[PDB]
Each structure stands twice: as C-alpha cells, then as structure tokens.
Amino acid sequence: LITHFRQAIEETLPWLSSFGADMTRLLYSPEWLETQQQFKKRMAASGLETRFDEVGNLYGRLNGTEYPQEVVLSGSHIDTVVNGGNLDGQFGALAAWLAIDWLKTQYGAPLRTVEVVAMAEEEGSRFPYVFWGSKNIFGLANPDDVNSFVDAMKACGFTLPNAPLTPRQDIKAFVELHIEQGCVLESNGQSIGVVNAIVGQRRYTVTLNGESNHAGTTPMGYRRDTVYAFSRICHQSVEKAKRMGDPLVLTFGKVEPRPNTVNVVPGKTTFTIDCRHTDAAVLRDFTQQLENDMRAICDEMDIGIDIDLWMDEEPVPMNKELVATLTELCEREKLNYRVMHSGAGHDAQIFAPRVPTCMIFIPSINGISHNPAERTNITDLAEGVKTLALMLYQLAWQK
Amino acid sequence: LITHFRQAIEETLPWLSSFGADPAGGMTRLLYSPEWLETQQQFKKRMAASGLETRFDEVGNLYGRLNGTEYPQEVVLSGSHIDTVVNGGNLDGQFGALAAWLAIDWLKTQYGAPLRTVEVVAMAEEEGSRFPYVFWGSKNIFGLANPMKACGFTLPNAPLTPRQDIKAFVELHIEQGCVLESNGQSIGVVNAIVGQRRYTVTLNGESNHAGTTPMGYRRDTVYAFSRICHQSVEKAKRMGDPLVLTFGKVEPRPNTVNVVPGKTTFTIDCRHTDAAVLRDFTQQLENDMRAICDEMDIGIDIDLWMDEEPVPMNKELVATLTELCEREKLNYRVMHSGAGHDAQIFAPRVPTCMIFIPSINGISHNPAERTNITDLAEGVKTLALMLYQLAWQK
C-alpha cells in the first residue's frame, strides 16, 4: 500500500508541482488559476464532484450513501511563498485527493460524504491578508478588509461579496496533512506526527535607549551601553526559557543597534522577540515575566525602553476525540509516530474552533520550508498519505 | 590672566571657527579641496601679523615660528590638526593650533624673542574623514607618509626628510571625553595614549524556523553573541579602568523576527594603556568566545585587524608639566588619552606631552561640542606657561 501511494505520489507530485516553478504560485495569479483548473480537471475525471466557492477554494466531494449532508473534509492551501518548496501546503491537498480516490475505488462510496479541498491561500504572500481561504469558509472574511485584490480576484473569475459569506455548517470533520517544517520527526527517526495542538504566538518590538558615546574616552562606569543591555536581556531570558522546556521556544532574531560602529557605544537598539507556547497562560505569564525582567534590567543601568507587543495570538488545540481516534489507529496500525504539537500556524487553526479538527505531520528534512530545498523522503510522503487514507476511512466509511 | 585669554579666545575662536561652517549644522572643513584652504590662509595672516615667520611645508601643514636667540635651531612646536569631520568640530584639533598661537603671541610680546625657537603649527589633517588616510600631516613632518594640486601642492616623489629639530612637541586637546568634566577638574596631564585593538568576530550557527525548531536543536548566533558580550563586559568592568571593552556593531542574519539567526557578525573595540594588560585580557576573550561557541556547536572567526600599541608621553615632559601644575594652584588631573591624536606619531620621535581641556558630556566631533570658555582660557594659559618653560626658560 505504501508502495502503491509512493507510485501515486511519484507520478502526481511532479505533475501538480509543475504549476508554478521558480516553486512560487501566489493568490489569484495566472499559475494559481491554472493550477486549480488542472486539479479540478483531474479531480472531476477521477469521479469527484468538483466546484469553487466565492473565494476560489476548490473541492472534491464523493457523496456519502447514508449521511450525504455530513462532510469529512481534508486538504490544505495551494499557494506558496515566492521561492518555496512543493511540499508545503500543496502536498496536503494532493494527499487528500489520493486517499479518497483509493478509498473510492476500494470500498465503494463512503457512508457519509468526503471532500478534498485545495484552499485559496494561507501564509500571506501576495496581499496583506492571511487565510483568505479558510476564513471565507466560515464567513470570517468581510470583503471590507481587502495590483487590485479585486482585479486579481476578478481576473480569475471571482468577486468579493459586499459582506461575509455564510459559514459552512455541514463540516463534520477536518484533517490537515502537513509537512512538519521542523526537525523533531527527522531527528527522532519518526514518520508520522499526531499534532495535538497548534502553538500560540506573541511578538514584540522593544527599543532600548541609553547614550551613544566614545568607545575609548568614556570610562566603563559612565556608560549606558544599549547593546550590553540587550545581551543581558537575551542571555538571561533564554536561560529561563530553556529551563521552562518544551514546548516553549524564545527568539531574538532581529537586532538594530545605532549607530552600529566598532568604536562607538551604541546609544539605541531596536530588537525583536518571538515567543510561542501551547498554553495561553504559560505563554502570557512567561512573556510578562520577561517584560518585567527587561525593565528591571533597564531601570538599573539607567536605560529607557519601549516594549511593543504587536502580535498576540492564542493557542488552538486540535479536537480530542479526533486525536485519540488517530493515535488509536497509529497503534491499531503499528506505526512510527510521535504525538507532538505545531510550532507553526496552519489553516487547521481556523477550522478547530468551529468544527472538530486534527492534523497529521510528516517529517521535514533539515526543517527547511518556504525554501526550494524543502523535501521529504518519498516513502514518508507515502506513509502520510497512507495514514490519512486510514483515518478518513474511520471517519467516513465506518458508522 | 585667565580672563585675559578668556577675551582672546572669545574674540579669536568665534571668527576662527567660522571658515568652513556648515549651515546644515556644525562644521565641515575636510582636507585639501576648498573651505579648508581658505582657513589655512587667514590663520597664516594673523600669524604673519606677528614676529611669526609663517610658511608651509611640502604637503600643507602651516607653521609660525618665533625665532629665538641662543639655540634658534632648537624648535619647540605646538599645535594640532586643522581639519574636522563632516559635522561638528569647533574645538577638536582646531583649538590646539589657536591656543599655541595665542600662547606664543602673548608670551613673545610680553617677553620678547625666546632662547629656543618657538613654533606654532596647524597640521594638515589627522583622523581624516575625506580620503582613506590618517595623520597625513604629522606623518610627512617626520617623513613617514609614503606618497591637493588644486590647493597648490604637489605630493612628493618620495618620503620627505624627517624633521630633526623639534626639541619638544606639545598638543592641547579637548579630551573628547567626560572625565575632567565629571570631576570638577579643568586640566589634564595626558600621561599616555591608549593602545587600541579591534576585532571582527564572525559567528556561524544555523537559521531555523522560530517555532517549529525546538530549543535543544537550536544554534542561535544571537544567543551566542549575548553570552559573549554579557561576560566579557562584566569582565572588563571588574578589570577596572582604564580598560574599555565595546561591542558596538552587531549584524545577525537573516535577522528577522521569526527566523533563528544562523549567522551574526559583531565587532569588538578593546583599549588599555599597558600593552601587556591589553593583550592578556583580549587573549582571554578570544578563549572565552572560542569556548562558548565550541560549546553550543557554533563556528567562530576572529579577525583582529587593528592592533596598535600604546604611545606613552615623554616621562620628563610630563613631570615638568605636573610641577608646572604645582607652582600654580592648578586644578589639574593626571590622566590618559582614550583616543589618538597627532601627538602619538610625534611621541616616538621627539619628546612630547599633551594638555587636556575638559569636554561637554564627552560629546565630540559632532556639532554639540563645547568646553567652558573659562576652561579654554585655563588651557591657553597653561600652554603659554609650559612653552615659556621650554623656549624662554634659563
């Protein structure tokens, strides 16, 4: 079976992957449109009832025999970052079509409707808006939020309405298969990850203001080094972070000292912070423990600071029943899995609070993603498509 | 006498500091091309407007000599760079050449021709902010500058002959710092010039997604830096003055909020008066850095590009100035020069010393410079005294 999908992937991945090379493919672009048409074409061919909604999401739908009004959804976004890979997103939609097609031509029609979905867009590429696909599905969009977006959208045969769409309410389940984008699975030697939650995020822009002096003619006790200060903050905080241990992650990815010259004591320093955790309390209590440590450190060496918490998003937990059922099949079907979480946001996070959802991770070699070097061993892709085939069966082909 | 010079400066300094004023803020003289030349001309006039045998040399320095009876071939030089940076100046360099002239003038008219020849100089550039060269003025003076025309000068076909007549050089500067200032002191007896060291350490870790990659699997090149700065600094701090350690330039990569930086190139600037103490500290740092990285599996790359040894001032020239500060109830302050001046390329050839005037809030080079008008007069005074003790002394 894994050998069966390995062929299936091996012959379909390069196919769909051929729509937007140099992999790009952004929201409402020619490639975007063409890609959706070639998928819808083949989806239709294989026996599915394809369609687009007002925003451009693409659907499969193999109608169920007993609960046609109950949909067990599966898919991922089809747009990529400029020079990203062909596995992030795009693959999860492919997988969904492949599992369903095999199940279709194997146990016959489901006893409740199954539906593949190639969502419009996730991870904001082209326009200043993210999740224009999964958000419209639940009417969270509001056209009054968005090269004219309307023109791009209209060029592809779409028109943003004058108000939010009607939130779908026939979705009984949603499962997203996504590459990890990390290195936990690859490192631990595991193939499938049962993600029980999606991390929450906080992001800051903190400015340090001391005094820019001479590096030689200024004694060390007359100084107000803003880069020494940052060092103290970063060094000291990351300690507390690691002590806290997983799933907590902390970053100081960007730093801008001014003037930024060897023989001048930096007087100002604008730096950032990226903290993520699966528990909103741990996340908030911690980031605030940090905010206190920083200003404590600054009132002390007489440096003024501005803390700007511009991004603050709450964690989102995958559905418990669906996770169990998964894990149970990752057992009932002897597999090499690891119940883990997601340090990245996905379309599955928009689904979760509305309909029960769960994700399935496949390793990512070198945690590369949103980069042309992202790959995954094909038999691992096969595993992920096989694990997704097995699950959808549990949800739609079983009463 | 302080409020005598206080009127001299208050009169001379405002008009002298006018040639090359920047309406955009501060002062911009800068080497050779116009605005600099005009200044070298009017400072030659008021010089010639005295028994000063004003002249130039092969590249552009300006002199003014008060020939003396008995040892007229022994020169006592005084002055400082006439150039300045894009914005600011006003007291940097310039005030040294102006003090020397007002100190010689007053002294010469109020004491007649000296034993040894006294000389004032307005050297052409130092710390130059226009072309990739520094000390082009004093270097040529001692034939050290291995090879303008629009200003009327043709650079030599070979290194000029070294001056072999300067009996003692004395440079009066603005400290460019805040030590004298924050001590309620006016004079500084520069005993030595700090011997700088500068590195360009490059850190190579690994860029990773800020959330999908766990903490144990990371190789943060900014966490690395944070550990290296906050460790070495608390070290320099306890080593105590006059040691100074400074990480002024950092540059992580990709250096964006949600990507762990997999590379960070930072800089180091460590200074100290004793060469042995400098070397030792900075040697240990390299060890500390090299240890912290090999620990968190990050590759370093320590590039030590500037390795300058300390330039002490003539020990004798320093005692005569210190006792000079004794006879007079002078509020001096024996200290070291945290920066380099023309006096550092003189010192190794002719006995030399430096007098320090307190400075702003350490503010220097930029237009916000200023030293209390009565502290300046104190300087031009003590300079006038010392020179008297070197060309008029029996």
PDB file of N, CA and C in Angstrom, chain A residues 47-77:
ATOM      1  N   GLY A  47     -13.763  11.033 -10.837  1.00  0.00           N
ATOM      2  CA  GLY A  47     -15.081  10.735 -10.300  1.00  0.00           C
ATOM      3  C   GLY A  47     -15.627  11.624  -9.209  1.00  0.00           C
ATOM      4  N   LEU A  48     -14.930  12.701  -8.888  1.00  0.00           N
ATOM      5  CA  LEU A  48     -15.401  13.597  -7.853  1.00  0.00           C
ATOM      6  C   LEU A  48     -16.183  14.753  -8.451  1.00  0.00           C
ATOM      7  N   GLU A  49     -17.077  15.301  -7.637  1.00  0.00           N
ATOM      8  CA  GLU A  49     -17.922  16.433  -7.984  1.00  0.00           C
ATOM      9  C   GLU A  49     -17.218  17.707  -7.562  1.00  0.00           C
ATOM     10  N   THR A  50     -16.423  18.273  -8.471  1.00  0.00           N
ATOM     11  CA  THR A  50     -15.661  19.498  -8.200  1.00  0.00           C
ATOM     12  C   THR A  50     -16.467  20.792  -8.227  1.00  0.00           C
ATOM     13  N   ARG A  51     -15.900  21.841  -7.627  1.00  0.00           N
ATOM     14  CA  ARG A  51     -16.543  23.155  -7.548  1.00  0.00           C
ATOM     15  C   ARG A  51     -15.648  24.159  -6.827  1.00  0.00           C
ATOM     16  N   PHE A  52     -15.924  25.439  -7.054  1.00  0.00           N
ATOM     17  CA  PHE A  52     -15.191  26.547  -6.438  1.00  0.00           C
ATOM     18  C   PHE A  52     -16.202  27.301  -5.593  1.00  0.00           C
ATOM     19  N   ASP A  53     -15.777  27.951  -4.519  1.00  0.00           N
ATOM     20  CA  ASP A  53     -16.756  28.757  -3.803  1.00  0.00           C
ATOM     21  C   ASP A  53     -16.454  30.186  -4.234  1.00  0.00           C
ATOM     22  N   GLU A  54     -17.101  31.160  -3.608  1.00  0.00           N
ATOM     23  CA  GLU A  54     -16.915  32.557  -3.993  1.00  0.00           C
ATOM     24  C   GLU A  54     -15.481  33.082  -3.965  1.00  0.00           C
ATOM     25  N   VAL A  55     -14.671  32.510  -3.093  1.00  0.00           N
ATOM     26  CA  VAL A  55     -13.309  32.952  -2.930  1.00  0.00           C
ATOM     27  C   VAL A  55     -12.292  32.171  -3.758  1.00  0.00           C
ATOM     28  N   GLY A  56     -12.679  31.004  -4.252  1.00  0.00           N
ATOM     29  CA  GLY A  56     -11.749  30.240  -5.063  1.00  0.00           C
ATOM     30  C   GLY A  56     -11.228  28.949  -4.465  1.00  0.00           C
ATOM     31  N   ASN A  57     -11.810  28.514  -3.354  1.00  0.00           N
ATOM     32  CA  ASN A  57     -11.385  27.268  -2.754  1.00  0.00           C
ATOM     33  C   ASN A  57     -11.913  26.185  -3.679  1.00  0.00           C
ATOM     34  N   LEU A  58     -11.151  25.113  -3.834  1.00  0.00           N
ATOM     35  CA  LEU A  58     -11.535  24.020  -4.711  1.00  0.00           C
ATOM     36  C   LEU A  58     -11.959  22.807  -3.908  1.00  0.00           C
ATOM     37  N   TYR A  59     -12.998  22.101  -4.359  1.00  0.00           N
ATOM     38  CA  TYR A  59     -13.481  20.927  -3.635  1.00  0.00           C
ATOM     39  C   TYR A  59     -13.608  19.632  -4.420  1.00  0.00           C
ATOM     40  N   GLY A  60     -13.504  18.504  -3.715  1.00  0.00           N
ATOM     41  CA  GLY A  60     -13.653  17.197  -4.332  1.00  0.00           C
ATOM     42  C   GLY A  60     -15.082  16.669  -4.185  1.00  0.00           C
ATOM     43  N   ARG A  61     -15.436  16.220  -2.987  1.00  0.00           N
ATOM     44  CA  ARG A  61     -16.770  15.677  -2.687  1.00  0.00           C
ATOM     45  C   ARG A  61     -17.214  14.394  -3.391  1.00  0.00           C
ATOM     46  N   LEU A  62     -17.138  13.305  -2.634  1.00  0.00           N
ATOM     47  CA  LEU A  62     -17.568  11.988  -3.070  1.00  0.00           C
ATOM     48  C   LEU A  62     -18.735  11.856  -2.110  1.00  0.00           C
ATOM     49  N   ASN A  63     -19.955  12.006  -2.615  1.00  0.00           N
ATOM     50  CA  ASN A  63     -21.147  11.943  -1.775  1.00  0.00           C
ATOM     51  C   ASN A  63     -21.382  10.647  -1.035  1.00  0.00           C
ATOM     52  N   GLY A  64     -21.723  10.785   0.243  1.00  0.00           N
ATOM     53  CA  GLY A  64     -21.981   9.636   1.088  1.00  0.00           C
ATOM     54  C   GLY A  64     -23.330   9.004   0.822  1.00  0.00           C
ATOM     55  N   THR A  65     -23.430   7.715   1.112  1.00  0.00           N
ATOM     56  CA  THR A  65     -24.660   6.970   0.889  1.00  0.00           C
ATOM     57  C   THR A  65     -25.679   7.084   2.022  1.00  0.00           C
ATOM     58  N   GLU A  66     -25.202   7.290   3.248  1.00  0.00           N
ATOM     59  CA  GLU A  66     -26.093   7.414   4.401  1.00  0.00           C
ATOM     60  C   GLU A  66     -26.170   8.805   5.023  1.00  0.00           C
ATOM     61  N   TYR A  67     -25.072   9.549   5.033  1.00  0.00           N
ATOM     62  CA  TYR A  67     -25.108  10.895   5.601  1.00  0.00           C
ATOM     63  C   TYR A  67     -24.497  11.842   4.595  1.00  0.00           C
ATOM     64  N   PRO A  68     -25.171  12.054   3.457  1.00  0.00           N
ATOM     65  CA  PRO A  68     -24.648  12.950   2.422  1.00  0.00           C
ATOM     66  C   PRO A  68     -24.459  14.387   2.902  1.00  0.00           C
ATOM     67  N   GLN A  69     -25.245  14.774   3.897  1.00  0.00           N
ATOM     68  CA  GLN A  69     -25.154  16.112   4.457  1.00  0.00           C
ATOM     69  C   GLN A  69     -24.033  16.267   5.468  1.00  0.00           C
ATOM     70  N   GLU A  70     -23.329  15.174   5.751  1.00  0.00           N
ATOM     71  CA  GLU A  70     -22.214  15.208   6.688  1.00  0.00           C
ATOM     72  C   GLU A  70     -20.907  15.078   5.933  1.00  0.00           C
ATOM     73  N   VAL A  71     -20.119  16.147   5.972  1.00  0.00           N
ATOM     74  CA  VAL A  71     -18.847  16.163   5.274  1.00  0.00           C
ATOM     75  C   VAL A  71     -17.628  15.976   6.166  1.00  0.00           C
ATOM     76  N   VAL A  72     -16.752  15.077   5.728  1.00  0.00           N
ATOM     77  CA  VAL A  72     -15.482  14.773   6.392  1.00  0.00           C
ATOM     78  C   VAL A  72     -14.454  15.381   5.430  1.00  0.00           C
ATOM     79  N   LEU A  73     -14.050  16.609   5.746  1.00  0.00           N
ATOM     80  CA  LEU A  73     -13.122  17.399   4.936  1.00  0.00           C
ATOM     81  C   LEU A  73     -11.634  17.105   5.123  1.00  0.00           C
ATOM     82  N   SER A  74     -10.871  17.338   4.059  1.00  0.00           N
ATOM     83  CA  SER A  74      -9.423  17.158   4.065  1.00  0.00           C
ATOM     84  C   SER A  74      -8.748  17.935   2.928  1.00  0.00           C
ATOM     85  N   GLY A  75      -7.728  18.708   3.298  1.00  0.00           N
ATOM     86  CA  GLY A  75      -6.986  19.487   2.330  1.00  0.00           C
ATOM     87  C   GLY A  75      -6.031  20.462   2.990  1.00  0.00           C
ATOM     88  N   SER A  76      -5.463  21.331   2.158  1.00  0.00           N
ATOM     89  CA  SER A  76      -4.519  22.357   2.586  1.00  0.00           C
ATOM     90  C   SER A  76      -4.477  23.403   1.479  1.00  0.00           C
ATOM     91  N   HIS A  77      -3.866  24.552   1.767  1.00  0.00           N
ATOM     92  CA  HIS A  77      -3.743  25.658   0.814  1.00  0.00           C
ATOM     93  C   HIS A  77      -2.884  25.289  -0.395  1.00  0.00           C
TER      94      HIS A  77
END
